[PDB]
C-alpha cells in the first residue's frame, strides 16, 4: 500500500525539471499541480499532466515497498534540487505525508489522494516510425522560431509534422517567413500530418536534448487527435493536436532565383545585429545593398540616427563574400527574421537566393541540405 | 563658424566607462573632449558621475547623446579603436574599420552642471576597505521610504575610525576601518542607490586595487575613486539613531559553527516555508543543532548538525540549558553571505532577545538580528 524507494538524486532532479514545465495553472483542478509517483517492478513512474499534455517518466530505483501517491510538483522539485546526497529515500507515512530523507535531513510533504489523478489517454495510431533523438531535435530547432504568435492565426501557432513519401518533415510559418526541416525515414510509411502545439514542441525538445537521451532514438505515434512520443523507452509524452489546416507551403519556396549571395555566416549575422541596434520597434528593417564588389548593410531609426557597414569581396573563408547577380539588388528584411535563421544552423557559410525586391529570399546552408528557409522582404 | 568634437578612443576603455554611465541613468550622457582627456558626465536625482578617460583628442568640443544608444552600439564594435566626430545637424558619428554610425545630439546648454561642495571632513581609504563596509551594511537598510532616519547607510567617523551602519528595525549591521589621518567626527546618510553605484565603481578591476577619497559635507558627499572617477551624491535628510546600545552586552550562550554549513542548511530548511511566515527554528544544545521549519499546507523540514571540532563541520554550543529560538532565514542569510569566513559565532540570551553575530576572521564587522516566535 505505502511507497518506499531509494532513488538517485541526480536522476530525480532531471525528471522533476521536465515535470515542472508541464504544470501550468490555467486549469482550476488543483490536483493537477501535483505529480503522481508509482513504485512498481523496480521502477518509479512519475506522471504529470495539464489536461492538454501528459508526461510519464520511468526511472530506475531500489523499490523497498511498492505504492503510489501524489505530491506537489514544485514543492518536491524545490526541495530535491537543494539536497547534496547522491541518493535519497522516499517513504510514504500516510497522515505525515511523503517523507524525504538524506544524511541528517528529513522533509515531510503533504500528499493528495491518487484516485482522482488522471491516467494517460489512449492513442490508436495511424502512423508510427522511429528516428534518432538528435535528428528530431534538429528539425524542431530548425522550425520553432518561425511559429506564429498571433493567436488569431490559429493553424500557424504550431509545428506541422508530416510524412510525405517516407520522409518526415517539420514546417512552421507566421505569414512572413517559412522554415522546413526533414529526415528520410528508414521504413516505408504512408502519408499523415498533424500540427503540434508550440508548448508541446518546447517540452519534447528539452527531453530529446538531454544528455541521457541524446544518442538514443524517439518513437513517434500519430493519430488524428493525438501524438505520442516514446523517447528512449522510459519517457512517454502524449499531446493533443491543433485542430486546423497547415497551408500548402511548397509554393512559398522560390524556384526561379536570379541573384546568389554566399557570405560568412558569423560575419553576416554579427553585422546584421550591430546595424539593427539603431532601429525602432515601429520599423524593424535593415537594407541589404548587394553588388558584385561588396554588400552594404544599412538601417535608419526615426529620431535616433542611422548606421552602415560594408562587407567587401573576399575568397577567404573567415571573411567570405561573393555575389553573383545579373543586376545589383537593393532589398530589405526584418533583421530579427534573418537572425533567427542564421543562428539556427551552426555552419561556416550561408547562401541566399534572390529574385525581385518584393519576392522572398531562399536561405540555404550547404552543410544542411534538408533545412529550407524562406523570408519575405520589407520596403526600405 | 562653429565648434566640433573629435576624439580617437580605445574601444575597451570607452566600454568600461559607458557601463558606469548606464547604471546611473537606470537621460543623456555629455561628452567633453579637452586637454587630451574625454570627460563623460551622467546624472540621476541623487548623484552626479564624471569620468575622464585618456584619449587622443583631435579637435576639442562638447555634445550630449543618448546614453543607451551610445552604450549599446559601442559594446558591439570589435575594433580596437574608434573615432567619434560631431557633425552638428548630423549628430555624433562613430566610425570603426568598416562601419559608420550617426546619432542625433541634444543641446548641451540644457545639461546640468555638478554642484559644488564645501567639505567639512576629508579622508582617504582603500577601495577594498570601502567595498567591504558597504557590502556589510547595504542589505539591512529600511525600505519604508518615509522613515528617513533609517533608509540610507549611516557613514560616520568617530574617534578617527570610519563606520558604516544600517538598520531596518529588525537587524543592525556595522562595519568600520581605522583611519590613517586624524579627523574630527562627522556623519551623513548615504542614499541606497548612491551606495550601490559607488560600490560598482570601487569593485571594478580598474579601481579595485586603488584608493578612494571621501569628502563629507552637510548636504552632499563626494567620492574621488582612483583620481579618475568623481561621484557627487545628495544626502538623506535625517538623524541616524545611536546604535551603540543595540549591541548585546549580556550573552549567556555562544554558538560556533561552520559558516557554509550553517548557511546552506538554513536555506534548504527554509524552502518549506511560505512568504507570510519566513521563520526557521534553531534548537541549540551542546550535542547538536536542529534547524527546523514549518510551511502551512506544505509540510515540515528538519536537519541536524552534530558536535565537531573539525573545521569543515565545526559545531560547538556553550550553553547550560538548551535554547529554542527562531529567526527570519533571510536576515541570517544576509549576514552569513556577507563575510567569506570559515567559522561564525552567534551570541544568545533569551528566546526573545537578539543574536549578536561575529566573524573571528573579520572583527570589525558586527551584526545584530532580532528573533521571531517559533
Curated annotation (Swiss-Prot), chain B:
UniProt main location, coarse: cytoplasm
This protein's UniProt keywords: Cytoplasm, DNA replication, DNA-binding, DNA-directed DNA polymerase, Nucleotidyltransferase, Transferase
GO cellular component, one term: DNA polymerase III complex
Cited InterPro entries: DNA_clamp_sf, DNA_polIII_beta, DNA_polIII_beta_C, DNA_polIII_beta_cen, DNA_polIII_beta_N
CDD domains referenced in this protein's UniProt entry, alphabetically: beta_clamp
Location in or out of the cell: Cytoplasm
Pfam family, one: DNA_pol3_beta
Top-rank taxon: Bacteria
Transmembrane segments: none
One GO BP: DNA strand elongation involved in DNA replication
An example molecular function term from Gene Ontology annotations: 3'-5' exonuclease activity
Subunit structure of this chain's protein: Forms a ring-shaped head-to-tail homodimer around DNA which binds and tethers DNA polymerases and other proteins to the DNA. The DNA replisome complex has a single clamp-loading complex (3 tau and 1 each of delta, delta', psi and chi subunits) which binds 3 Pol III cores (1 core on the leading strand and 2 on the lagging strand) each with a beta sliding clamp dimer. Additional proteins in the replisome are other copies of gamma, psi and chi, Ssb, DNA helicase and RNA primase.
Family as reported in the entry's similarity comment: Belongs to the beta sliding clamp family.
Chain's role: Confers DNA tethering and processivity to DNA polymerases and other proteins. Acts as a clamp, forming a ring around DNA (a reaction catalyzed by the clamp-loading complex) which diffuses in an ATP-independent manner freely and bidirectionally along dsDNA. Initially characterized for its ability to contact the catalytic subunit of DNA polymerase III (Pol III), a complex, multichain enzyme responsible for most of the replicative synthesis in bacteria; Pol III exhibits 3'-5' exonuclease proofreading activity.
Protein name: Beta sliding clamp
The species this protein was found in: Rickettsia bellii (strain RML369-C)
Amino acid at each position: 500500500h505505502m511507497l518506499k524507494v531509494i532513488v538517485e538524486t541526480k536522476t530525480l532532479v532531471q525528471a522533476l525539471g521536465f515535470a515542472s514545465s508541464v504544470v501550468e495553472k490555467r486549469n482550476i483542478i488543483s490536483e493537477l499541480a501535483n505529480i503522481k509517483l508509482l513504485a512498481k517492478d523496480g521502477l518509479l513512474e512519475l506522471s504529470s499532466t495539464n489536461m492538454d499534455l501528459y508526461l510519464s517518466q520511468k526511472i530506475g530505483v531500489q523499490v523497498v515497498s511498492e505504492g503510489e501517491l501524489t505530491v506537489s510538483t514544485k514543492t518536491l522539485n524545490d526541495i530535491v534540487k537543494k539536497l547534496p546526497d547522491s541518493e535519497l529515500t522516499l517513504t510514504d507515512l500516510g497522515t505525515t505525508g511523503l517523507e524525504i530523507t538524506g544524511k541528517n535531513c528529513r522533509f515531510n510533504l503533504f500528499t493528495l489522494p491518487v484516485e482522482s489523478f488522471p491516467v494517460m489517454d489512449n492513442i490508436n495510431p495511424e502512423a508510427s516510425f522511429k528516428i534518432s533523438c538528435a535528428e528530431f531535435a534538429k528539425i524542431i530547432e530548425s522550425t520553432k522560431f518561425s511559429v506564429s504568435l498571433d493567436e488569431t492565426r490559429y493553424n500557424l501557432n504550431g509545428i506541422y509534422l508530416h510524412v510525405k513519401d517516407s520522409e518526415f518533415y517539420a514546417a512552421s510559418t507566421d505569414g512572413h517567413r517559412l522554415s522546413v526541416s526533414s529526415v528520410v525515414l528508414a521504413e516505408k510509411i504512408e502519408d499523415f500530418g498533424v500540427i503540434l502545439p508550440q508548448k508541446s514542441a518546447e517540452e519534447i525538445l528539452k527531453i530529446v536534448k538531454d544528455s541521457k537521451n541524446a544518442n538514443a532514438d524517439i518513437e513517434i505515434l500519430l493519430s488524428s487527435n493525438k501524438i505520442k512520443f516514446i523517447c528512449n523507452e522510459n519517457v512517454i509524452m502524449l499531446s493533443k493536436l491543433i485542430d486546423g489546416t497547415f497551408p500548402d507551403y511548397s509554393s512559398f519556396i522560390p524556384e526561379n532565383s536570379s541573384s546568389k549571395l554566399v557570405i560568412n555566416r558569423k560575419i553576416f549575422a554579427d553585422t546584421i545585429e550591430r546595424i539593427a541596434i539603431i532601429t525602432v520597434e515601429k520599423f524593424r528593417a535593415v537594407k541589404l545593398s548587394l553588388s558584385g564588389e561588396a554588400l552594404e548593410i544599412s538601417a535608419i531609426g526615426e529620431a535616433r540616427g542611422n548606421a552602415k557597414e560594408v562587407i567587401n569581396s573576399s575568397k577567404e573563408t573567415e571573411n567570405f563574400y561573393e555575389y553573383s547577380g545579373e543586376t545589383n539588388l537593393d532589398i530589405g528584411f526584418n533583421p530579427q527574421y534573418l537572425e533567427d535563421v542564421l543562428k539556427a544552423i551552426k555552419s561556416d557559410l550561408v547562401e541566399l537566393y534572390f529574385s525581385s525586391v518584393s519576392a522572398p529570399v531562399l536561405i540555404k546552408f550547404p552543410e544542411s541540405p534538408k533545412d529550407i528557409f524562406v523570408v519575405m522582404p520589407v520596403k526600405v
